[PDB]
Amino acid sequence: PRRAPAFPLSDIKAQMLFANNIKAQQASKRSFKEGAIETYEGLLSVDPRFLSFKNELSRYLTDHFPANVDEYGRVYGNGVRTNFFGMRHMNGFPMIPATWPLASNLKKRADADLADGPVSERDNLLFRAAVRLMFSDLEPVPLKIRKGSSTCIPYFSNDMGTKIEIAERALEKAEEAGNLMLQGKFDDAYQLHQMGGAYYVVYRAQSTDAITLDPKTGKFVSKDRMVADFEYAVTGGEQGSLFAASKDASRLKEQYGIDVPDGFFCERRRTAMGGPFALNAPIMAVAQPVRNKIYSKYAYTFHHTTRLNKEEKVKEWSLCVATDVSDHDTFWPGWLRDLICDELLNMGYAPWWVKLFETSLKLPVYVGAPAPEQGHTLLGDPSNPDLEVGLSSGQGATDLMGTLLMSITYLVMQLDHTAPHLNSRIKDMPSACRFLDSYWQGHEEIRQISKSDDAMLGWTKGRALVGGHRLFEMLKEGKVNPSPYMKISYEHGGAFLGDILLYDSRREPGSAIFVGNINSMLNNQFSPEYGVQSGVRDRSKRKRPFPGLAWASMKDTYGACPIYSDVLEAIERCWWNAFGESYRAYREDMLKRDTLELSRYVASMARQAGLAELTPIDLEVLADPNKLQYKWTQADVSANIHEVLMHGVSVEKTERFLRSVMPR
Ligand SMILES: [Mg+2]
Ligand SMILES: [Mg+2]
Secondary structure, X not given: OOOOOEEEOOOHHHHOOOOOOHHHHHHHHOOOOOOOOEEEOOEEOOOHHHHHHHHHHHHHHHHHOOOOEOOOOOEOOOOOOOXXXXXXXXXXXXXXXXXXXXXXXXXXXXHOOOOOOOOOHHHHHHHHXXXXXXXXXXXXXXXXXXXXXXXXXXXXXXXXXXXXXXXXXXXXXXXXXXXXXXXXXXXXXXXXXXXXXXXXXXXXEEOOOOEEEOOOOOOEEEOOOEEEOHHHHHOOOOOOOEEEOEOEOOHHHHXXXXXXXOOOEEEEEEEEEEOOHHHHHHHHHHHHHHHHHHHHOOHHHHOOOOHHHHHHHHOOOOEEEEEEEOOHHHHOOHHHHHHHHHHHHHHOOOHHHXXXXXXXXXXXXXXXXXXXXXXXXXXXOOOOOOOEOOOOOOOOOHXXXXXXXXXXXXXXXXXXXXXXXXXXXXXXXXXXXXXHHHHHOOOOOEEEEEEOOEEEEEEOOOOOHHHHHHHHHHHHHOOOOOOOOOOEEEOOOOEEOOEEEEOOOOOOHHHOEEEEOHHHHHHXXXXXXXXXXXXXXXXXXXXXXXXXHHHHHHHHHHOOOOOHHHHHHHHHHHHHHHHOOOHHHHHXXXXXXXXXXXXXXXXXXXXXXXXXXXXXXXXXXXXOHHHHOOOOOHHHOOHHHHHHHEEEEOHHHHHHHHHHHOOO
């Protein structure tokens, strides 16, 4: 059922993806690379004292604080959902091999018994109503670009000046490029305007993953992560194999002379993709105004900040169901891309812009190095983009694509299983829009708070409440999938956007509280995804600009966890045993140094200003800007702090671009 074409790096089709510069050529050729991360300045992830510390601490905390999760996946008591063995990885050393990305997810969806389009007219109206509500009365804003981010295919530039030029040029030439694509002239659009080509596959670490201790043997077991070989990826699973990647770290002693303590493993590696910047810039110019609309008008469902902000909504509910979606990005349906595009055309959006948007979600993928002696292959033909990868992580609107799919998927689940009396309110497009507008503002007896694949579904008192309880029971039983669209289950230890919903003896939302996840504190402090990048002079360009700052926001973020104090004492005791030093003093010194360094980057901050004007969100984001890509948004961060991490193209250039895209 159609194997995707594949081209080696030597092929002209792959060569055309990399510009005639050292950075682009190095990216094309880069072989498999691995190494210990510099966890903190002058400390490697594989340091014997650090691994001794991790062994003692993970064992102690699991022993003294076993998980408190009930039969319905509700967290209670200590606020712990699993063991603390997730920290036991040799950070910087990945599992081998990483997966080859699936060129087509059509068979994957069909075999999982998931729909190839909207099941009913009601569902079709709801998905289309979501497009009309999300993309309608948008306001232009400056196009913000992350400092130090790559432009990927074809230039691979990390320079802000070059990035601004590329983005401004892209906004000027998007119409001409989109019109060429409408004529089927993809090669011309790419050659002239660098809009097309492929996504560049980057493999990212998921630093902590499940590890269990087998009581029978006293030996640790890592969670098996299934990977697809090249044959499986190109055939969409028709041929080739899906097998467990090797997390065995024994190899590090032989290859690198690194001592590997018992029960320490190689890290899980996830595919991530970087988009061709010239294609992403015109998409981002529309995506940011869309986020501003949904986070303002539909703030109830979509805008999530603090644990108390979430708590105020959830406390009003009679029932709260914390859902889980299996492999969201790979299962994301191409028919939704086509439905979105069709509806934007119906609204009066520029056909050339819709074509660029459509193309961004069908683009080929360049596979770098999943393992030693593997990769350097382009999947799909850039002359006619036709891939069905699901949702590409580096696309300019991925968060919105996951949010649109999932928000409607959950609403449909609530309609099907709990509220058939509301079906009469969804008769046509105007009534579908009126109903969805009301639902998204939290005005109906069925409610939700969501972001992509993370959500909490609510029921107030009323006719739907009884159905709500049956749906929860169906999820607990786990025999029937409640959705025709995605694989839905209940979360084992309900949480929403990093905050655990802590229930009491009553097991009711009214008396439940949102608390920080203590395991996330440990993940962030002892298993960061990236090293400190001490060689990158401009700190704002680093993946972890100011790691020391997270100590100042720790109490605000995690202080509400029942075992907060216990964990900090256990850390201090174990760090003393391992290093013969105070961890608290070590972090206080790092906090002082990073606070001083920060003033160099903030115009409003004098030579030794201090953190007085900064919020806990500001501090968490300066230590980890990745939180700005999955947890928070621009409006949640102080203006002077957002400027440290991002730079923009003028609103004058974006305003003119947006006028040409949008309906009359
Ligand atoms: Mg899952
Ligand atoms: Mg959830």
